Amino acid sequence: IARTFYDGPEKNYEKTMAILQIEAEKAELRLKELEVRRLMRARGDGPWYQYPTIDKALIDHSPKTTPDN
Amino acid sequence: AGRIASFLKNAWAKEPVLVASFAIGGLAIILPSLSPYTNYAIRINRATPYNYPVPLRDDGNMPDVPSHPQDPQGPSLEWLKNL
Ligand SMILES: CCCCCCCCCCCCCCCCC[C@@H](O)O[C@H](CO[C@H](O)CCCCCCCCCCCCCCC)COP(=O)(O)OCC[N+](C)(C)C
Ligand SMILES: CCCCCCCC/C=C\CCCCCCCC(=O)O[C@H](COC(=O)CCCCCCC/C=C/CCCCCCCC)COP(=O)(O)OCCN
Secondary structure, eight states, rough: OOOOOOOOOOHHEEEEHHHHHHHHHHHHHHHHHHEEEEEEEEOOOOOOOOOOOOGGGOOOOOOOSTOOO | OOHHHHHHHHHHOOOOOHHHHHHHHHHHHHHGGGGHHHHHHHHHHHOOOOSOOOOOOSSSSTTTOOOOTOOOOOOOOHHHHOO
């Protein structure tokens, strides 16, 4: 029965280790992502949460019929 | 091209005002694109000095910018005087 239908314990052992490593990495990544999101929303210095500002290319840098603009 | 003549005849017999209005409007749309004076009108509008011309700081590299209004450089409005 063991030869025909089942395998050794080493296979399940090492598969369990691989699964545990994947899940632990995923958990640490989720926590890190939450912290990064909080920091980016608080500060705004990162790529995320970059709300638009007025484009400076719309400014007209020409004499304005009045020296004091 | 043959039935349109009869249609125009009927319209002129019955609705001269509509025919006149449509002819005048069509002329109004199509004529300005075929006129050589619209460019002259644009240039006349562009040549009206509403604003003070601010002088440029001399750097020695403007052969085409006048130093005085009576200098030969700069745009000329002699086309407007003869227009
Ligand atoms: C000498 C023996 C004396 C005593 C007899 C004891 C009787 C025991 C037989 C009863 C078997 C119970 C069913 C349990 C089947 C386990 C299914 C599965 O777990 O096994 C698969 C193995 O496949 C097997 O071939 C399963 C075949 C059994 C199919 C059962 C069907 C029986 C129904 C018969 C009904 C009658 C039909 C006629 C209708 C009129 C696993 O696939 P695989 O990942 O690759 O193999 C991994 C292990 N390896 C790598 C070491 C090989
Ligand atoms: C491309 C130019 C377009 C812009 C110019 C137009 C300027 C403004 C004119 C349009 C104003 C509104 C249009 C009016 C539409 C009226 C249509 C209608 O249903 O009226 C008909 C009357 O008119 C008609 O029969 C239908 C159209 C008749 C001819 C209208 C013009 C057709 C084209 C004429 C000009 C063709 C191109 C120019 C060449 C001129 C020839 C040298 C019914 O008459 P009732 O008053 O209701 O009846 C009361 C009496 N029982």
